[PDB]
Amino acid sequence: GSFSKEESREFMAIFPDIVRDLTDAGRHTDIPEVTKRFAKVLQYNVPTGKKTRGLSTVIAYKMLEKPENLTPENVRLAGILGWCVELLQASLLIMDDLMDRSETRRGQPCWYRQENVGFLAINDCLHVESSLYSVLRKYFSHLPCYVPIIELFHDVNFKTNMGQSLDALCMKDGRPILSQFTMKRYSSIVKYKTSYYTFQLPVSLGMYLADMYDPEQHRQAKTILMEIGEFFQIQDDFLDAFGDSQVTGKVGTDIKEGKCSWLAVVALQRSNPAQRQIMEEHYGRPEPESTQIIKNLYIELGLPATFAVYEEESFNIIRTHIHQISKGLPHDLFFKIMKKIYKRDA
Amino acid sequence: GSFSKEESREFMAIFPDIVRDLTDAGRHTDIPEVTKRFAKVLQYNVPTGKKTRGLSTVIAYKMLEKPENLTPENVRLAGILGWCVELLQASLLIMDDLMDRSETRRGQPCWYRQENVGFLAINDCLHVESSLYSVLRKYFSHLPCYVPIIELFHDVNFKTNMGQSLDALCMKDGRPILSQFTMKRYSSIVKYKTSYYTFQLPVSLGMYLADMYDPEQHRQAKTILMEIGEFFQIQDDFLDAFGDSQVTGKVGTDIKEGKCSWLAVVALQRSNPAQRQIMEEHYGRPEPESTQIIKNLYIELGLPATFAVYEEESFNIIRTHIHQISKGLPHDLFFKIMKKIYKRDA
Numbered sequence: 001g002s003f004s005k006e007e008s009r010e011f012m013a014i015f016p017d018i019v020r021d022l023t024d025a026g027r028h029t030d031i032p033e034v035t036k037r038f039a040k041v042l043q044y045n046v047p048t049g050k051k052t053r054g055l056s057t058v059i060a061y062k063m064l065e066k067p068e069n070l071t072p073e074n075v076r077l078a079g080i081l082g083w084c085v086e087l088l089q090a091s092l093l094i095m096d097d098l099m100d101r102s103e104t105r106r107g108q109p110c111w112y113r114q115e116n117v118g119f120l121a122i123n124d125c126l127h128v129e130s131s132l133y134s135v136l137r138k139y140f141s142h143l144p145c146y147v148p149i150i151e152l153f154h155d156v157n158f159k160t161n162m163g164q165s166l167d168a169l170c171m172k173d174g175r176p177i178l179s180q181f182t183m184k185r186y187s188s189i190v191k192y193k194t195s196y197y198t199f200q201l202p203v204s205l206g207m208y209l210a211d212m213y214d215p216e217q218h219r220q221a222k223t224i225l226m227e228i229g230e231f232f233q234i235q236d237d238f239l240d241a242f243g244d245s246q247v248t249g250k251v252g253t254d255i256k257e258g259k260c261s262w263l264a265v266v267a268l269q270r271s272n273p274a275q276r277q278i279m280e281e282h283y284g285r286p287e288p289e290s291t292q293i294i295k296n297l298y299i300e301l302g303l304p305a306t307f308a309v310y311e312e313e314s315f316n317i318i319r320t321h322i323h324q325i326s327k328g329l330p331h332d333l334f335f336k337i338m339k340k341i342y343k344r345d346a
Numbered sequence: 347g348s349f350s351k352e353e354s355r356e357f358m359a360i361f362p363d364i365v366r367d368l369t370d371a372g373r374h375t376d377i378p379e380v381t382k383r384f385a386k387v388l389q390y391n392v393p394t395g396k397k398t399r400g401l402s403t404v405i406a407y408k409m410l411e412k413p414e415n416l417t418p419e420n421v422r423l424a425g426i427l428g429w430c431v432e433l434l435q436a437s438l439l440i441m442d443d444l445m446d447r448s449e450t451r452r453g454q455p456c457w458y459r460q461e462n463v464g465f466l467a468i469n470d471c472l473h474v475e476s477s478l479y480s481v482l483r484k485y486f487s488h489l490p491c492y493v494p495i496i497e498l499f500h501d502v503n504f505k506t507n508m509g510q511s512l513d514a515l516c517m518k519d520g521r522p523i524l525s526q527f528t529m530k531r532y533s534s535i536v537k538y539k540t541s542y543y544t545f546q547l548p549v550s551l552g553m554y555l556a557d558m559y560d561p562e563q564h565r566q567a568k569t570i571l572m573e574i575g576e577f578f579q580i581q582d583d584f585l586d587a588f589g590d591s592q593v594t595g596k597v598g599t600d601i602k603e604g605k606c607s608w609l610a611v612v613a614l615q616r617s618n619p620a621q622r623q624i625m626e627e628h629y630g631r632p633e634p635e636s637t638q639i640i641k642n643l644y645i646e647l648g649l650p651a652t653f654a655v656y657e658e659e660s661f662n663i664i665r666t667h668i669h670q671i672s673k674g675l676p677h678d679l680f681f682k683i684m685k686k687i688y689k690r691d692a
């Protein structure tokens with residue numbers, strides 16, 4: 001547990017085998033041009049993030065499984081399951097960068113902006129997603145958890161798509177629909193676009209690999225992880241406006257794209273009539289000066305301190321909710337996840 | 347069998363239930379804005395094609411299953427399985443139209459060109475694909491064929507992505523790689539981008555729903571269906587240059603996008619040095635006059651008559667190969683598929 005350097009190195013050591021499995025490395029193919037290119041798609045887009053979701057899968061398994069069952073082989077299976085989550089993440093971010101007209105991801109150009117990619121990034125998005133099911137078939141097809149694991153990936157993929165769609169409906173006729181930027185809409189967006197795939201998916205996979213199918217245990221885990229998910233996406237929204245791109249690895253676009261971000265929702269709650277006028281005039285505009293005006297309003301409204309205090313109070317509340325978790329569910333699993341993301345700058 | 351009007355009407359009657367299943371029609375949702383929009387995504391993009399692949403799934407089942415097992419309920423399951431193939435087709439075409447910068451699909455604007463879609467079509471592509479697995483879980487999760495069916499969809503999706511990628515690598519530095527436009531490259535492209543999902547997938551699904559898992563029966567079916575698939579994509583390539591858009595429902599882009607089409611490959615085989623120079627100068631150019639010059643060369647080289655004769659000879663050869671099919675595999679299934687596509691103008 002505790003997302004150590006050793007934990008990261010054991011997880012990273014699996015990645016080259018995932019690439020070999022999906023590119024027929026060492027095996028005859030009639031289409032080597034595609035398998036060689038797909039190696040570069042995977043190497044660019046999959047392994048250079050924080051790997052929070054992959055590592056969370058392994059830590060969940062290690063803390064849920066009986067100690068006597070934690071063989072090197074079973075721990076490797078959990079790591080492979082973690083990489084399947086990272087393949088879903090990689091696919092989502094390729095598509096998300098196209099939709100958000102983003103510049104940088106993980107400190108390199110967004111994949112769609114690279115030479116001879118463009119709209120081919122759409123196919124690469126689909127290709128990376130489809131590839132996780134090939135890995136699942138190879139290593140898990142013989143196990144009782146196989147169908148539960150596949151059905152969970154299918155369901156989380158569908159839910160994430162619904163979330164990406166609601167996120168995108170922030171604008172119509174080139175202006176943001178500020179009247180609809182409520183905390184209710186915000187909670188709905190982040191539940192579907194982030195919480196299911198980021199927190200619910202890793203822990204539920206850990207439970208399934210340990211042959212834990214109890215509906216009440218899954219429901220209790222889900223309740224806490226959907227709260228953690230909302231908290232995580234609020235942190236992401238703060239990073240978009242106030243993050244250092246040299247640390248976050250990405251340049252923010254939420255203001256220009258007119259997104260229903262936490263900062264936008266809270267700005268509208270805290271705004272006097274004049275400040276509301278500034279949002280209505282300058283939010284979701286292409287002009288750099290319009291973005292700077294909105295950032296200046298965010299600073300004037302004290303959004304940095306408001307976020308800082310919200311993050312501390314939300315951390316305390318989630319810790320209270322974790323204390324209420326029963327069954328055999330280890331509290332320390334949820335505490336470790338929270339400790340890993342709390343007050344993050346990336 | 348025989349793709350009758352009655353067959354089409356029975357298949358079409360299932361579609362509204364597929365839409366209701368994927369949009370929580372009659373059920374409470376916290377995100378009605380997305381479920382209502384997704385109804386319009388499905389209604390626009392899924393049901394207005396020829397439905398050859400969906401209908402082929404039903405006809406395969408009806409000709410492989412024991413007559414006493416062809417209850418209305420089992421025939422409905424085959425139709426639902428057919429609609430899962432049509433969801434995969436719908437997803438592929440949304441993405442393919444973005445990548446091919448196409449104007450029209452099924453006699454209406456390409457989905458990405460509609461108001462307030464754009465790059466959101468990428469998400470809609472992913473959403474429509476993920477949705478077929480929800481339908482599979484609802485109606486088939488209790489059946490022996492469930493895992494075989496899921497694994498076949500996963501494998502065919504991955505293969506189709508590899509094919510879309512090879513298709514896209516026709517150009518580098520804005521010029522087509524005419525030296526690589528060989529019949530060998532062509533056969534590889536169409537095997538992956540068309541044959542698996544168009545012909546192999548429907549018949550293999552029909553076999554699985556009839557609990558036919560014999561590896562040799564699947565291999566024999568695959569051999570004929572990969573031949574039919576290549577034949578079908580050659581017909582598609584002819585339609586791109588010489589089709590009537592009022593009949594095909596789509597405007598061709600292969601010449602402008604510099605595609606390794608059958609017409610391009612055969613043009614290069616049949617071209618004298620001067621005619622080769624015309625391809626090298628005018629193939630894969632944005633200027634309308636460049637496209638017209640290539641179409642004029644195609645007419646001069648007699649590509650219409652060359653295609654017409656190829657189609658007749660290929661039909662005869664495939665019919666010979668079908669005669670060689672053994673086991674209990676019904677020859678009439680493969681004959682019906684060929685009769686449905688032979689000399690098509692759409």
Ligand SMILES: CC(C)=CCC/C(C)=C/COP(=O)(O)OP(=O)(O)O
Nearest residue numbers: 049050051106107246247248249346
């Ligand atoms: C060279 C640099 C500065 C790289 C930045 C790496 C980084 C902090 C990525 C976040 O993980 P992710 O990409 O998986 O995203 P998420 O925040 O959604 O977990």
Ligand SMILES: CC(C)=CCC/C(C)=C/COP(=O)(O)OP(=O)(O)O
Nearest residue numbers: 395396397452453592593594595692
């Ligand atoms: C109003 C008009 C003219 C509509 C055209 C309909 C049509 C012939 C679609 C082909 O089916 P499809 O879209 O499923 O494609 P494919 O050729 O790949 O089967």
Ligand SMILES: O=P(O)(O)C(O)(Cn1ccnc1)P(=O)(O)O
Nearest residue numbers: 092093096100167193194236240
């Ligand atoms: O803000 P987004 O939702 O676009 C983002 O968090 C990615 N994402 C997409 C869905 N869930 C998360 P990112 O800031 O990484 O570009």
Ligand SMILES: O=P(O)(O)C(O)(Cn1ccnc1)P(=O)(O)O
Nearest residue numbers: 438439442446513539540582586
């Ligand atoms: O020619 P394409 O491969 O792009 C096509 O056939 C679609 N497609 C994509 C993959 N297989 C078939 P369409 O002419 O319908 O645009």
Ligand SMILES: [Mg+2]
Nearest residue numbers: 096097100102
């Ligand atoms: Mg983004």
Ligand SMILES: [Mg+2]
Nearest residue numbers: 096099100167
């Ligand atoms: Mg986004």
Ligand SMILES: [Mg+2]
Nearest residue numbers: 236237240254
């Ligand atoms: Mg963000």
Ligand SMILES: [Mg+2]
Nearest residue numbers: 442443446448
């Ligand atoms: Mg096309």
Ligand SMILES: [Mg+2]
Nearest residue numbers: 442445446513
């Ligand atoms: Mg295409």
Ligand SMILES: [Mg+2]
Nearest residue numbers: 582583586600
């Ligand atoms: Mg075509």
